[PDB]
Symmetry: C2
Subunit: 341 residues, 2 copies
């Protein structure tokens, strides 16, 4: 009654890299609907970005890029809580407290830290080590019931659960202070594969950019990449859906289906008797451009309306802090701090 009857979801949005068409089809395309079915928070995680050395100007602009992509796919500041992490002071504050309820061993065993320790040698910074604790704060501040996490963030989510449980057991065993978060289950299981290796999931961090279409990719680059996509060895060519034997075509059919709304049964019929993949790949690229272009256009407009973006940031930070401060006050009272008068 009413937001109180929907689950609370918190999503972390990175201000770095470029989102892929897999991220779009697997997640962002569904955000406008999720905003109606869940009480959603979208946090642009700039405090986590600086765990690796960032060019300052690039980070600044990437933050605005992330905010604008959220708006472009239909995140509404009035219907969701959309904000930049560093704008909401409660995040770092709860993070410090939660450090005191996190075991060193729990952080040292994190696979993401162990990788970066190996890459950076003695330079490895304490932020990279500690960011799972800050992630836990990010989630727990909002009492999120559900959190979307990639494969590489699952261990981190488990630690958040462990920290919340530990704290609740100490301070509030009968009326818990923290909600124990669970993974969010996406409503579309998109299967977007690397364009030149259809056996491998499309990855936004792939060094091989021939495998990847990004959400803000130039339409001409999208067309070229799709025209060079893996098909299959079937002779004569046959456009039919089959992941095991026709993986490349299956990936193209999945893209065409997403872009046009056509079912695999309609696509098979459309190309019945066509013994060539070239025209089909042209059709797919054009369809993918037509799907993304409207998002790109909305993005490019929103992105250069700084007065609007500032309004969004201001209103989101206020809305987020109002919620987060309630949690922070309860945590501070529980551990024994004197409340600020």
């Amino acid at each position: 009654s009413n937001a109180m009857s929907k689950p609370i979801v918190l999503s972390g949005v990175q201000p770095s890299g470029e989102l892929s068409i897999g991220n779009y089809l697997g997640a962002l395309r569904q955000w406008q609907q999720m905003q109606d079915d869940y009480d959603c928070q979208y946090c642009v995680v700039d405090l986590h970005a600086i765990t690796v050395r960032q060019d300052p100007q690039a980070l600044h602009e990437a933050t605005l890029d992330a905010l604008a992509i959220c708006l472009a796919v239909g995140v509404d500041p009035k219907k969701s809580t959309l904000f930049v992490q560093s704008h909401v002071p409660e995040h770092a504050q709860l993070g410090w407290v939660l450090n005191c309820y996190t075991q060193m061993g729990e952080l040292s065993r994190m696979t993401q830290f162990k990788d970066k320790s190996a890459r950076y040698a003695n330079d490895v910074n304490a932020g990279l080590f500690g960011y799972p604790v800050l992630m836990a704060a990010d989630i727990l501040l909002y009492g999120a019931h559900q959190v979307p996490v990639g494969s590489d963030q699952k261990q981190h989510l488990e630690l958040a659960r462990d920290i919340a449980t530990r704290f609740n057991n100490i301070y509030s065993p009968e009326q818990p202070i923290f909600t124990i978060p669970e993974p969010y289950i996406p409503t579309v299981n998109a299967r977007v594969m690397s364009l030149q290796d259809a056996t491998k999931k499309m990855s936004k961090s792939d060094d091989n950019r021939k495998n990847v279409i990004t959400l803000l990719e130039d339409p001409k680059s999208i067309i070229k990449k799709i025209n060079k996509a893996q098909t299959d060895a079937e002779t004569p060519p046959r456009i039919a859906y089959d992941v095991e034997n026709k993986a490349g075509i299956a990936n193209l059919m999945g893209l065409y289906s997403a872009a046009t709304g056509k079912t695999f049964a309609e696509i098979e019929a459309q190309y019945a008797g066509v013994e060539m993949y070239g025209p089909f790949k042209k059709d797919v690229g054009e369809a993918v451009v037509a799907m993304l272009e409207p998002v790109q256009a909305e993005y490019q407009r929103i992105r250069n309306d700084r007065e609007y973006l500032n309004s969004v940031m201001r209103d989101g930070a206020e809305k987020a802090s109002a919620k987060a401060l309630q949690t922070l006050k309860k945590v501070y009272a529980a551990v024994g701090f004197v409340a600020r008068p």
Copy 2:
């Protein structure tokens, strides 16, 4: 012109344990004067207290105890910046950022962490590991030129210097953002020794309480402890100052001198020809009670005036945040964050 012409000093005040008469004579007795000669901040470090498991109610009350002891020795909220750490949100915020410029190796080699790791086994928490970074934030927020540090905090102060230098070299090599802090040099080198082992400095954390007089110790306990203090083996007894050969008497003479203003030359003359230590120890205990009692009385009054304490906390947090936020904004801009609009 005018506060801008005095050095900035930040002192950390623990909300745990009990301050000793050595802490009083070595440090706190001089705070009223320091407040005039330096631009002083006194931070009650409750965020650092929770790096070890605290009873919540005990921590709450210990915070108020610490605040009241500062006021009782003459820290004036109008002349100094006196506040509780957790009341000023900028501390945890800068702490997170500074984690990202601190090497894991720098924290792992800290002697204080290595001790606690050995004591707590797998329980050792990430707060105990990371608190040098938060200490650095506590200092750097105020642009402190000088920081009083005990032997056990010197390594931590060096890390603050290292972090400030590293950050300045990256972001501001010509116009530094951070002031590089140095140790504060106390104006009185008090030599307050353990009462039953005059060869060892009096320690507030001594398990042997017979060695320690605390600032808020009951006068009757002070009298008993001083009457059982170490003297020396000289026969006939002779009250004369000599640290190497008459350490126990030297310690008692130092206490009597502090308490009465009498020089060692006056004390020697006062007891000329007196071949007994008993009357002298009675005189010392009475003098020490008379010195501390007025502080105790002011403390006990201030401590139970919650409206006043709340005023002090409110005004101090406002004053501290106004300074700290200026530093935080500069740091956030430098690393590349979008400023909250």
